Amino acid sequence: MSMSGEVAKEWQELDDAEKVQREPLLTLVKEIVPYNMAHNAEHEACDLLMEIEQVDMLEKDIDENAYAKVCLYLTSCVNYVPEPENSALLRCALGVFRKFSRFPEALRLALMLNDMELVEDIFTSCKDVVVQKQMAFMLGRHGVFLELSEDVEEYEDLTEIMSNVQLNSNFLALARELDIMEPKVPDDIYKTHLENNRFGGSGSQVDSARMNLASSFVNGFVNAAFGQDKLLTDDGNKWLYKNKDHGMLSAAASLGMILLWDVDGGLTQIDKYLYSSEDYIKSGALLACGIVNSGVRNECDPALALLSDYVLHNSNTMRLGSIFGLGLAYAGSNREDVLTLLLPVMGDSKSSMEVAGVTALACGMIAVGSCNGDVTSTILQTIMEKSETELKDTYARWLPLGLGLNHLGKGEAIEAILAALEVVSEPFRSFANTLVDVCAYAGSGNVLKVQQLLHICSEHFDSKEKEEDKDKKEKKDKDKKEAPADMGAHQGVAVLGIALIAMGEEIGAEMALRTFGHLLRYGEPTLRRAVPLALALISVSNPRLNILDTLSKFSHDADPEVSYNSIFAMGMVGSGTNNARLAAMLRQLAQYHAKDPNNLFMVRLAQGLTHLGKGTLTLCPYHSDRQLMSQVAVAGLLTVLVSFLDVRNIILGKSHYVLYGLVAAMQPRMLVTFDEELRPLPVSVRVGQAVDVV
Amino acid sequence: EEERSKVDDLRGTPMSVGTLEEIIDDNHAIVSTSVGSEHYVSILSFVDKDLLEPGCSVLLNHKVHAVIGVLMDDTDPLVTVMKVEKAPQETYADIGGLDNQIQEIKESVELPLTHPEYYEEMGIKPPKGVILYGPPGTGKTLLAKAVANQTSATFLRVVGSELIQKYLGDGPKLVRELFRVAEEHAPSIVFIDEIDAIGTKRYDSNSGGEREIQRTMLELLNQLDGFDSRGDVKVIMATNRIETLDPALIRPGRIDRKIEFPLPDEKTKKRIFQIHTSRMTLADDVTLDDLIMAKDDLSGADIKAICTEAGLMALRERRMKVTNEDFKKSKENVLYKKQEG
Numbered sequence A: 001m002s003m004s005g006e007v008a009k010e011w012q013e014l015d016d017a018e019k020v021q022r023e024p025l026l027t028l029v030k031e032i033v034p035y036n037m038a039h040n041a042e043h044e045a046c047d048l049l050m051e052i053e054q055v056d057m058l059e060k061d062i063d064e065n066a067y068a069k070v071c072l073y074l075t076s077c078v079n080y081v082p083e084p085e086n087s088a089l090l091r092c093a094l095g096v097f098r099k100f101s102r103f104p105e106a107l108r109l110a111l112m113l114n115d116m117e118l119v120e121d122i123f124t125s126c127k128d129v130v131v132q133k134q135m136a137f138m139l140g141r142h143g144v145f146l147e148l149s150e151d152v153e154e155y156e157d158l159t160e161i162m163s164n165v166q167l168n169s170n171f172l173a174l175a176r177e178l179d180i181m182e183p184k185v186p187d188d189i190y191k192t193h194l195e196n197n198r199f200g201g202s203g204s205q206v207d208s209a210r211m212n213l214a215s216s217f218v219n220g221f222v223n224a225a226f227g228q229d230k231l232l233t234d235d236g237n238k239w240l241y242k243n244k245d246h247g248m249l250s251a252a253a254s255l256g257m258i259l260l261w262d263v264d265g266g267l268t269q270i271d272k273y274l275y276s277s278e279d280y281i282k283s284g285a286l287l288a289c290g291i292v293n294s295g296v297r298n299e300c301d302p303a304l305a306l307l308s309d310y311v312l313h314n315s316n317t318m319r320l321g322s323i324f325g326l327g328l329a330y331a332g333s334n335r336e337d338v339l340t341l342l343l344p345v346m347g348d349s350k351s352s353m354e355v356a357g358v359t360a361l362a363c364g365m366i367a368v369g370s371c372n373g374d375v376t377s378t379i380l381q382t383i384m385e386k387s388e389t390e391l392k393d394t395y396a397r398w399l400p401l402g403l404g405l406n407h408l409g410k411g412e413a414i415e416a417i418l419a420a421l422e423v424v425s426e427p428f429r430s431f432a433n434t435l436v437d438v439c440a441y442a443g444s445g446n447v448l449k450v451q452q453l454l455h456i457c458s459e460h461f462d463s464k465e466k467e468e469d470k471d472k473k474e475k476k477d478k479d480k481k482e483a484p485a486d487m488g489a490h491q492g493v494a495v496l497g498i499a500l501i502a503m504g505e506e507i508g509a510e511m512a513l514r515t516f517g518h519l520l521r522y523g524e525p526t527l528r529r530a531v532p533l534a535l536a537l538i539s540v541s542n543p544r545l546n547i548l549d550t551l552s553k554f555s556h557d558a559d560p561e562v563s564y565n566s567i568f569a570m571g572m573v574g575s576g577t578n579n580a581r582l583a584a585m586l587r588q589l590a591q592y593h594a595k596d597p598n599n600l601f602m603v604r605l606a607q608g609l610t611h612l613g614k615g616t617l618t619l620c621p622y623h624s625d626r627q628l629m630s631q632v633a634v635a636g637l638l639t640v641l642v643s644f645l646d647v648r649n650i651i652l653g654k655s656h657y658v659l660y661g662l663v664a665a666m667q668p669r670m671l672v673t674f675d676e677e678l679r680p681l682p683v684s685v686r687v688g689q690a691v692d693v694v
Numbered sequence B: 001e002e003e004r005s006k007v008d009d010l011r012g013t014p015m016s017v018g019t020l021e022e023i024i025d026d027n028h029a030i031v032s033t034s035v036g037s038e039h040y041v042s043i044l045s046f047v048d049k050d051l052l053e054p055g056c057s058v059l060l061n062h063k064v065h066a067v068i069g070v071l072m073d074d075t076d077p078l079v080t081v082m083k084v085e086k087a088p089q090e091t092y093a094d095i096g097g098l099d100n101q102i103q104e105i106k107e108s109v110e111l112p113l114t115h116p117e118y119y120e121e122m123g124i125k126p127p128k129g130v131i132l133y134g135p136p137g138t139g140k141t142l143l144a145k146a147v148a149n150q151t152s153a154t155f156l157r158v159v160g161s162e163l164i165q166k167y168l169g170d171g172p173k174l175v176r177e178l179f180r181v182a183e184e185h186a187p188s189i190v191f192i193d194e195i196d197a198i199g200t201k202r203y204d205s206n207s208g209g210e211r212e213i214q215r216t217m218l219e220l221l222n223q224l225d226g227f228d229s230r231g232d233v234k235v236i237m238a239t240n241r242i243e244t245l246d247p248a249l250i251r252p253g254r255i256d257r258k259i260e261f262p263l264p265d266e267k268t269k270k271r272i273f274q275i276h277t278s279r280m281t282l283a284d285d286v287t288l289d290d291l292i293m294a295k296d297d298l299s300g301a302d303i304k305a306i307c308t309e310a311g312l313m314a315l316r317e318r319r320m321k322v323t324n325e326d327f328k329k330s331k332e333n334v335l336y337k338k339q340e341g
C-alpha cells in the first residue's frame, strides 16, 4: 500500500496486515518494488515485515529468506490456524531445497545467520507439536542435522537414511564430532550390546564391495582383537570367498604373525639375565618371580618344566605367575594347553586360593576368547564340582575375570551358582571379594540384573555389600550421565562418590575437574586418601600437566596410606609417556628412612613410568636400569623387599612383547588391573600378591 | 572443638588491628602500632611464629594486646597493578611470515614450564629471558606474540619507569615489589613496554636528577642481576630504540635474545591484510593485492586500521559490506594520515 512508502518513521508497519488481510490481496508486488529498490527512502527493511507474509502465502521461496535477514525476531511468531501453517510450511520445505544445489554440485551455503537461523527458528514450532520430517533430511546440510535432534534415548537413533559413500564420509565425520560430546559414540559397536547382527553386517559392509583397499580396518582389526566374539560374529558376517576365511581368523595366524612382528622390533634378553638370576636361585619374595617367565617365554618349553617342577613345592603363592605362564606360553598363539591347563585344578578341597586356586584361575584368565565353546562349560562344571572349599571369598575374587571379559552377553549365568555361598556373612573379607566378583561377572545392561540381585541378596540388605552393589549398577551403564543423578545420596561411606565419578564419566575431554575437585574439598577427612584413585580413567587425555602437578604436594605427605595411593593414582595412566622431570624426581625418593613396603612401592612403581614394553635393543639400554637396581639393593640389607623390587622393575622391564597402548587405544579398559588395583589400597599381607599378575 | 569456645573469651569481646614490627629473639614481639603501642606475644596457636615476620600487621587484644591471629591484606596498589588476568583471545597464528622471529622465541616461551625436559637433559641451563626491539613503533605485534604467551603460566605487562619518576626516590621500590611480588606469583612472566627511561628526557610531576633516574634503571637490572635471585618471572623487555639503553643490560640478561622486527614485505602485507577483511565483507571489485601492492613501507597497525575508514561510511550508511570504491578513495584519508600526519 501507499502507507509503507511514507517518509514518516512513526511506528509501526508490522502486523497491520492482520487487521485488513483479504482486501490488500487484490494488489501485487509491483507497488512494493519501487519502495525497496529505490535508495534514500524511508522504511526500506521495515516493509519486509509486511512483505514476508505476502511472499510466504504465495508459496514462492528464496524470497522469504532475503526479507527475513533484517527481522531476525518476528519470524518466530507469524500469522493462528495450523492448517495453512503446516501447508505453506511443507510446500516451502520442498520448495526451498529445489532452489539450492541447482548449479549443480554446490557451492554450499552461503552456519550462516540467514538460512540456519531461519530453518531453526521455524523448526522449534516444527518439533513442538505437528507434522514431522523437516528439511534437515531433505536439504542434506549436516549443520542443521545437529539442531535436528531433540533430547531422547539415543539407543534407537543408531539408524540413519542410507546414501552414497561420498556424502556418507562427511556425514559420519560430522556425526562423530557431534557424538563425542554425547554419551553414545559411533564406536559404541564395541561396548554395545546391541549384539544383534546389524552392527556386524554394517561393520562388514563399510568396506564393501572393494576387497583390495579393505586390508585396513579388517586385517588390522582381526589381529588387534583379543576377544573371539568379534572374530565370531564378524565371521558369520564375512562373505569373502567361501568358508576359508578361518585361516586369518580365530586369532591363530593373527597372533602368530604379530608375535614375530614383536620379535622383529624386539627383543627382550633371555639367557643373560635369567641365568644370572638362576645362579641366585629363588628370591625371598615368593611373589613376582613367577610372572617373569610368563611374558618372557613364550614360547620355550624347557623353562616351563622348571616352572612346574619348582611350584610343585606348593610354597605360598609363587605358583601364580608360573602356572599362569604354563598356559600363557602355548596360548601365546593358539589354542592352546586348555587340555592340561585345567588338569591341576581338580588334581590339587583347595583349601585356599594360593594352593589350588592358581591353576583354577589359569584356565579362566589365560582363555582370552574361549568359550570356543568347551572352555565355558568346562569352567562352569569344574567350579560346580568344588564349592564349600573355595569358598565364597578368596578364589571367587578372580573367577569372574575369566567370563565377562570374553563375552559380556553370554547366556550362561555363573553368578547365581557362585552366589549361593554368600551365607558366610563375613563382613571384612567380603568387601574386596564381592566388589569385583559381582562387578566382573558381566556388563549386564538390561537393568533387570541389578533389580534381581538386589532383591534376592539384600532381602533385607547386607548394610555393606549394597554399597558396592549400587556401584555395580553405576558401572553397568557406561557414561550414561545418570551417575551425577545417582550421587544425590552421598552416604557417609563415601565409596560411592569416588567410583561414581571415575567409572560413571567417560569422555574425551576431562570436564570432571569441577566435580572431582568439589568432592575432595567438600569431603570429610580421611576421604582424600581414596580421591586420587579416579586418575586411572579421566586422566588419559593430558596427564602430563595435571597429574605430576597435583600429586607432587601429596607425594611428600607423611601418611603411608595417602602416599601409597598417590604414586598408585599416577600408576599406569602416567606410565605411557616419559619425561625428564620424572627421572630427576626419582632422586631423594629412595633415600628416605621410612620403613614398610610403601617406600619401595613409591619408588619402584615410579621406575615403571619410563616406558612400557619398549627396548632394549632398540631402544633404551638396560645397563642403566641394572646399575639402578644394583645400587638400590645394597640397603638394609634385607629387607627382602629389595629382592622384591629388583624383580619388580624387570617384570614390565624385561617382559616386553606387549604394547600398551593404553590399554587400550581402541578404548577397552583392562579388567584385571583395576580390580587388582582396588584391593591393595589396604594391602596388609597377601592381597598385593594377587595384583602381581599384571 | 572446645578450644573454639575456650579461647574466644580470651579473644573476646573485640580485638584490635596491630602492626607487626620487631621481635625479642625469645619470641616476645615488640610492635609499633597506633599509636606506637608495643606488646610481648609468645602465644602457641595459629603460628607459624617465624614467618609472620617483621614489617607486617597483626591483630591485638584489648587486655592485654596479644596478637591471636594475622592476615595478608591486599588489595593495595601492589597487587592491583599486576592483574587481572587476562589472556585476550588473540594468538600467535595471527602474525604470519615472521614465524622465523617467533620460532626463535618459541623455545623461549615454550621451554620454561611446558616441555621443560630437554633444558635439564642438556642441563646447560638457558633461563636467560628475552629482550625485544624493532621499528618503527612496534611491540604490539610483539604483544601479538605476548597475547599468545598467555596460554602458559601467568603474565604482567608494565610501561616504563614512570612510577619512579613521579617523585624523588622512592628508590626503585615500586619496581622492587613488582619484581619480588613476581616471586610471590612465581613462576610467572613480566614485561615492560618500550623503555623510555633516558630515551624520553623530561618527567611528569617532580623528578631529578639524571643519576637518580639513571640508578633506578641501574638498580632495576642490579636487583634483577641479582644477589642472588633464582626467581622467575621470566623477564621480557623491549624498547624500539636500541640507542638510549645502557649496553651493559644485555650481558647479565637477557644475553642471548633481542628480537629484530623486520618491516612488512609485499606478501607479508598480503598475509596480514586478509585476516582483518576476513570478517568485513568486501564488495565484488575489492582486491587485497593491488592496493597494498602499490603502497610501500606500511605498518601492520595501518593495514589493520585502513579497514576502519570503510567501517565509517559503510557504517554511516549502515552496511555490512566494504566497498573498494570507498576503500580506495577513503584510503587517501589514511594515506593523508601517513602523508600529511
Ligand SMILES: Nc1ncnc2c1ncn2[C@@H]1O[C@H](COP(=O)(O)OP(=O)(O)O)[C@@H](O)[C@H]1O
Residues within 6 Å of the ligand: B094, B095, B096, B137, B138, B139, B140, B141, B142, B143, B144, B271, B272, B275, B299, B300, B301, B302, B304
Ligand atoms: N598478521 C597480522 N594480523 C593482524 N594484525 C597484525 C599482523 N601483523 C601486525 N599486525 C598489527 O600491527 C600492529 C603494530 O603494533 P605496534 O607498532 O607493535 O604497536 P605498539 O605501539 O603498541 O608497539 C599491531 O597492533 C598488530 O595488530
